[PDB]
Design an enzyme around this catalytic site. Structure first.
Site, PDB file in Angstrom:
ATOM      1  N   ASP A  65       2.286  14.659 -14.551  1.00 44.61           N
ATOM      2  CA  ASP A  65       1.786  13.926 -15.691  1.00 44.61           C
ATOM      3  C   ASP A  65       1.513  12.458 -15.406  1.00 44.61           C
ATOM      4  O   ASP A  65       2.415  11.615 -15.401  1.00 44.61           O
ATOM      5  CB  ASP A  65       2.854  14.115 -16.742  1.00 44.61           C
ATOM      6  CG  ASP A  65       2.476  13.546 -18.071  1.00 44.61           C
ATOM      7  OD1 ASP A  65       1.456  12.904 -18.221  1.00 44.61           O
ATOM      8  OD2 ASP A  65       3.233  13.746 -18.978  1.00 44.61           O
ATOM      9  N   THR A  66       0.193  12.157 -15.208  1.00 44.54           N
ATOM     10  CA  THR A  66      -0.187  10.753 -14.891  1.00 44.54           C
ATOM     11  C   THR A  66       0.014   9.820 -16.056  1.00 44.54           C
ATOM     12  O   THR A  66       0.068   8.612 -15.967  1.00 44.54           O
ATOM     13  CB  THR A  66      -1.664  10.629 -14.455  1.00 44.54           C
ATOM     14  OG1 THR A  66      -2.572  11.166 -15.451  1.00 44.54           O
ATOM     15  CG2 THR A  66      -1.895  11.395 -13.168  1.00 44.54           C
ATOM     16  N   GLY A  67       0.155  10.448 -17.219  1.00 42.97           N
ATOM     17  CA  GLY A  67       0.395   9.671 -18.442  1.00 42.97           C
ATOM     18  C   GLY A  67       1.789   9.235 -18.771  1.00 42.97           C
ATOM     19  O   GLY A  67       1.988   8.511 -19.715  1.00 42.97           O
TER      20      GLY A  67
HETATM   21  C1  LIG Z   1       5.225  16.102 -24.053  1.00 49.43           C
HETATM   22  C2  LIG Z   1       3.926  16.742 -23.560  1.00 49.43           C
HETATM   23  C3  LIG Z   1       3.835  16.677 -22.038  1.00 49.43           C
HETATM   24  S1  LIG Z   1       3.996  18.493 -24.135  1.00 49.43           S
HETATM   25  C4  LIG Z   1       2.902  18.256 -25.555  1.00 49.43           C
HETATM   26  C5  LIG Z   1       1.633  19.072 -25.335  1.00 49.43           C
HETATM   27  N1  LIG Z   1       0.689  18.693 -26.393  1.00 49.43           N
HETATM   28  C6  LIG Z   1      -0.456  18.146 -26.046  1.00 49.43           C
HETATM   29  O1  LIG Z   1      -0.860  18.140 -24.894  1.00 49.43           O
HETATM   30  C7  LIG Z   1      -1.212  17.500 -27.193  1.00 49.43           C
HETATM   31  C8  LIG Z   1      -1.189  16.005 -26.986  1.00 49.43           C
HETATM   32  C9  LIG Z   1      -2.325  15.325 -26.635  1.00 49.43           C
HETATM   33  C10 LIG Z   1      -2.267  13.972 -26.426  1.00 49.43           C
HETATM   34  C11 LIG Z   1      -1.085  13.288 -26.565  1.00 49.43           C
HETATM   35  C12 LIG Z   1       0.059  13.956 -26.915  1.00 49.43           C
HETATM   36  C13 LIG Z   1      -0.001  15.314 -27.128  1.00 49.43           C
HETATM   37  C14 LIG Z   1       1.883  20.573 -25.260  1.00 49.43           C
HETATM   38  O2  LIG Z   1       2.740  21.130 -25.922  1.00 49.43           O
HETATM   39  N2  LIG Z   1       1.068  21.260 -24.470  1.00 49.43           N
HETATM   40  C15 LIG Z   1       1.095  22.727 -24.467  1.00 49.43           C
HETATM   41  C16 LIG Z   1       0.540  23.323 -25.741  1.00 49.43           C
HETATM   42  C17 LIG Z   1      -0.815  23.561 -25.865  1.00 49.43           C
HETATM   43  C18 LIG Z   1      -1.328  24.070 -27.040  1.00 49.43           C
HETATM   44  C19 LIG Z   1      -0.489  24.352 -28.098  1.00 49.43           C
HETATM   45  C20 LIG Z   1       0.867  24.127 -27.977  1.00 49.43           C
HETATM   46  C21 LIG Z   1       1.377  23.616 -26.801  1.00 49.43           C
HETATM   47  N3  LIG Z   1       2.576  16.847 -25.544  1.00 49.43           N
HETATM   48  C22 LIG Z   1       2.653  16.187 -24.227  1.00 49.43           C
HETATM   49  C23 LIG Z   1       2.630  14.645 -24.290  1.00 49.43           C
HETATM   50  O3  LIG Z   1       2.929  14.022 -25.298  1.00 49.43           O
HETATM   51  N4  LIG Z   1       2.290  13.997 -23.177  1.00 49.43           N
HETATM   52  C24 LIG Z   1       2.419  12.531 -23.112  1.00 49.43           C
HETATM   53  C25 LIG Z   1       2.607  12.069 -21.669  1.00 49.43           C
HETATM   54  O4  LIG Z   1       1.428  12.304 -20.918  1.00 49.43           O
HETATM   55  C26 LIG Z   1       1.264  11.814 -23.833  1.00 49.43           C
HETATM   56  C27 LIG Z   1       1.507  10.326 -23.942  1.00 49.43           C
HETATM   57  C28 LIG Z   1       1.136   9.468 -22.933  1.00 49.43           C
HETATM   58  C29 LIG Z   1       1.402   8.116 -23.031  1.00 49.43           C
HETATM   59  C30 LIG Z   1       2.034   7.617 -24.146  1.00 49.43           C
HETATM   60  C31 LIG Z   1       2.406   8.470 -25.158  1.00 49.43           C
HETATM   61  C32 LIG Z   1       2.144   9.823 -25.051  1.00 49.43           C
HETATM   62  C1  LIG Z   2       2.156   8.102 -25.282  1.00 58.26           C
HETATM   63  C2  LIG Z   2       2.310   7.777 -23.797  1.00 58.26           C
HETATM   64  C3  LIG Z   2       1.069   8.143 -23.001  1.00 58.26           C
HETATM   65  S1  LIG Z   2       2.523   5.975 -23.767  1.00 58.26           S
HETATM   66  C4  LIG Z   2       4.318   5.989 -23.609  1.00 58.26           C
HETATM   67  C5  LIG Z   2       4.643   5.307 -22.281  1.00 58.26           C
HETATM   68  N1  LIG Z   2       6.035   5.604 -21.921  1.00 58.26           N
HETATM   69  C6  LIG Z   2       6.274   6.405 -20.891  1.00 58.26           C
HETATM   70  O1  LIG Z   2       5.408   6.752 -20.109  1.00 58.26           O
HETATM   71  C7  LIG Z   2       7.712   6.858 -20.732  1.00 58.26           C
HETATM   72  C8  LIG Z   2       7.742   8.363 -20.769  1.00 58.26           C
HETATM   73  C9  LIG Z   2       8.239   9.085 -19.703  1.00 58.26           C
HETATM   74  C10 LIG Z   2       8.244  10.457 -19.769  1.00 58.26           C
HETATM   75  C11 LIG Z   2       7.751  11.106 -20.883  1.00 58.26           C
HETATM   76  C12 LIG Z   2       7.262  10.394 -21.947  1.00 58.26           C
HETATM   77  C13 LIG Z   2       7.260   9.027 -21.886  1.00 58.26           C
HETATM   78  C14 LIG Z   2       4.323   3.805 -22.355  1.00 58.26           C
HETATM   79  O2  LIG Z   2       4.264   3.189 -23.406  1.00 58.26           O
HETATM   80  N2  LIG Z   2       4.117   3.193 -21.196  1.00 58.26           N
HETATM   81  C15 LIG Z   2       3.791   1.768 -21.117  1.00 58.26           C
HETATM   82  C16 LIG Z   2       4.967   0.831 -20.965  1.00 58.26           C
HETATM   83  C17 LIG Z   2       5.100   0.067 -19.821  1.00 58.26           C
HETATM   84  C18 LIG Z   2       6.148  -0.820 -19.685  1.00 58.26           C
HETATM   85  C19 LIG Z   2       7.078  -0.947 -20.695  1.00 58.26           C
HETATM   86  C20 LIG Z   2       6.957  -0.186 -21.839  1.00 58.26           C
HETATM   87  C21 LIG Z   2       5.904   0.699 -21.973  1.00 58.26           C
HETATM   88  N3  LIG Z   2       4.664   7.390 -23.625  1.00 58.26           N
HETATM   89  C22 LIG Z   2       3.607   8.292 -23.164  1.00 58.26           C
HETATM   90  C23 LIG Z   2       3.849   9.778 -23.429  1.00 58.26           C
HETATM   91  O3  LIG Z   2       4.631  10.201 -24.260  1.00 58.26           O
HETATM   92  N4  LIG Z   2       3.108  10.593 -22.686  1.00 58.26           N
HETATM   93  C24 LIG Z   2       3.052  12.032 -22.890  1.00 58.26           C
HETATM   94  C25 LIG Z   2       1.688  12.550 -22.420  1.00 58.26           C
HETATM   95  O4  LIG Z   2       1.546  12.445 -21.013  1.00 58.26           O
HETATM   96  C26 LIG Z   2       4.250  12.771 -22.259  1.00 58.26           C
HETATM   97  C27 LIG Z   2       4.382  14.236 -22.684  1.00 58.26           C
HETATM   98  C28 LIG Z   2       3.804  15.262 -21.957  1.00 58.26           C
HETATM   99  C29 LIG Z   2       3.951  16.570 -22.365  1.00 58.26           C
HETATM  100  C30 LIG Z   2       4.677  16.867 -23.499  1.00 58.26           C
HETATM  101  C31 LIG Z   2       5.257  15.863 -24.227  1.00 58.26           C
HETATM  102  C32 LIG Z   2       5.101  14.560 -23.813  1.00 58.26           C
END
Ligand SMILES: CC1(C)S[C@H]([C@H](NC(=O)Cc2ccccc2)C(=O)NCc2ccccc2)N[C@H]1C(=O)N[C@@H](CO)Cc1ccccc1
Ligand SMILES: CC1(C)S[C@H]([C@H](NC(=O)Cc2ccccc2)C(=O)NCc2ccccc2)N[C@H]1C(=O)N[C@@H](CO)Cc1ccccc1
Lengths: 99, 99
Positions: free
Chosen positions: A25-27
């Site tokens: 997860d690059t995010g």
């Molecule tokens: C926690 C996750 C890795 S798991 C869930 C995912 N949902 C999605 O991808 C929808 C989605 C789209 C965009 C954002 C969030 C959620 C899922 O359940 N995928 C299977 C699935 C597929 C279809 C139906 C049910 C389940 N969200 C992901 C997530 O928040 N990633 C963050 C880190 O990259 C994202 C993030 C990055 C930076 C800061 C904050 C958040």
């Molecule tokens: C919404 C996001 C893209 S932005 C925030 C991020 N935090 C992190 O990455 C910490 C972190 C580590 C691990 C997991 C989640 C969050 C941030 O704000 N980073 C700048 C930052 C830099 C310096 C200081 C403070 C903040 N969370 C991410 C997120 O939930 N991504 C999901 C989609 O990929 C992840 C996801 C994927 C699948 C299912 C569910 C969720």
């Protein structure tokens, strides 16, 4: 390997004697695994995603194999829906984006 | 291009006449943008992940431009921390993971 994104980029990890699947997860800045048994001491910490906020335990210097490649790093453990390999470790196994 | 993950993979997007930055995110299935001016109509949808769940609006067949590349697809808009480009548009621009 090279990985396209038509599917979710799930990979096998070995951590702590146990086999898991985890998302590349690059995010995510950090790595977070679902609740597990790790030996080895921890600090509490919080992270934030989309619907707010979770409390996790931080374990440092944990060994992890990710798709056969080794890495050592910080690993959070906590109520994430899925296991996530984030940027702290993706850099250690050499992982890039391309387009 | 080739992006390394020592920093967050932020890119410039152009959408709806507006220039923005967004995160390339292999761990998101969808693309979600912060609240912003979009023309049209849309449906209620909900997404979640780590803090839980959110409410977003769904707009289909939005044109977006991601680092010079045009793509058309579904964009969600909502109370996300940062603009996310998810796998639904990453496939469009030919994006791979590599290690
Ligand atoms: C926690 C996750 C890795 S798991 C869930 C995912 N949902 C999605 O991808 C929808 C989605 C789209 C965009 C954002 C969030 C959620 C899922 O359940 N995928 C299977 C699935 C597929 C279809 C139906 C049910 C389940 N969200 C992901 C997530 O928040 N990633 C963050 C880190 O990259 C994202 C993030 C990055 C930076 C800061 C904050 C958040
Ligand atoms: C919404 C996001 C893209 S932005 C925030 C991020 N935090 C992190 O990455 C910490 C972190 C580590 C691990 C997991 C989640 C969050 C941030 O704000 N980073 C700048 C930052 C830099 C310096 C200081 C403070 C903040 N969370 C991410 C997120 O939930 N991504 C999901 C989609 O990929 C992840 C996801 C994927 C699948 C299912 C569910 C969720």
């Amino acid at each position: 390997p090279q990985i396209t994104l038509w599917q979710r980029p799930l990979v096998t990890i070995k951590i702590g004697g146990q086999l898991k699947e985890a998302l590349l997860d690059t995010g995510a800045d950090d790595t977070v695994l679902e609740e597990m048994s790790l030996p080895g001491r921890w600090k509490p910490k919080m992270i934030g995603g989309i619907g707010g906020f979770i409390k996790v335990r931080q374990y440092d210097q944990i060994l992890i194999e990710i798709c056969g490649h080794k890495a050592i790093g910080t690993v959070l453990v906590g109520p994430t829906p899925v296991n996530i390999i984030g940027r702290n470790l993706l850099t250690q196994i050499g992982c890039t984006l391309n387009f």
